[PDB]
Design a protein around this ligand. Sequence first.
Ligand SMILES: [Ca+2]
Ligand SMILES: [Ca+2]
Ligand SMILES: [Ca+2]
Lengths: 137, 140
Amino acid sequence: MLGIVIATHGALSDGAKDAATVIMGATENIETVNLNSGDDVQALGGQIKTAIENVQQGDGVLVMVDLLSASPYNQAVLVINELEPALQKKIFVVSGTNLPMVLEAINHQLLGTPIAEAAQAIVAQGKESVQAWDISM
Amino acid sequence: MLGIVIATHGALSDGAKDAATVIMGATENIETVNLNSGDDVQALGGQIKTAIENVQQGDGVLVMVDLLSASPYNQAVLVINELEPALQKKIFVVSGTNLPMVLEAINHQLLGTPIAEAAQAIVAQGKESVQAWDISMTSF
Ligand SMILES: [Ca+2]
Ligand SMILES: [Ca+2]
Ligand SMILES: [Ca+2]
């Protein structure tokens, strides 16, 4: 089954995962990594690899991060570079991660969707799910 | 000062503020609401209304929910629909909030950006922030 690793600053990863459980009832094969104040980013790389390895079942791993170009994103990309080219081509990194994206990801987990096709699907959803509303509409 | 109310299923709203705190330091005028397994949605209605009121200061309020068309969102709308006219015109609801949208919101809070203008900018950055990277982009 597709693996998911949500990596972020603070407890955002645990929260996104908590929110998905409230909506779905349960979740499976989803690890969360947190970068806290005073954490050495040197170690984040290690926690991200451990997590990826803990969800790899042979269908790839979706590494969902919070902020493009921030530490979680950087370390994720850098760790991927040091893995066997085999899974290396099955690991995708999505940024700007939001609940709709995590839900879409879980959806592909259940569907068995090939990760490359899943990644695009998640990116579309995420973007399309960002809109504003006001009383004038 | 612009007010912000992050409302989500579970602890997501608290995790977003924590993450944003980790990056920008101590924030101000940000309320977090949660909808947990078992909670009554009407109660969430009042919870949002309260958060909105504890943060409303003349410059409007950004209500950041997690998912479009779900209880947090639907209740935000129901609440805003029954608010006194001088207040409702300035409350905006943005969906699919991610860390970048929150950080962007905190920035407009500091700039004093007019809310209708801040909302459009938060949506643009939010959409722009969603991307995917894979080893093929680095392989030649
Ligand atoms: Ca964890
Ligand atoms: Ca709160
Ligand atoms: Ca008060």
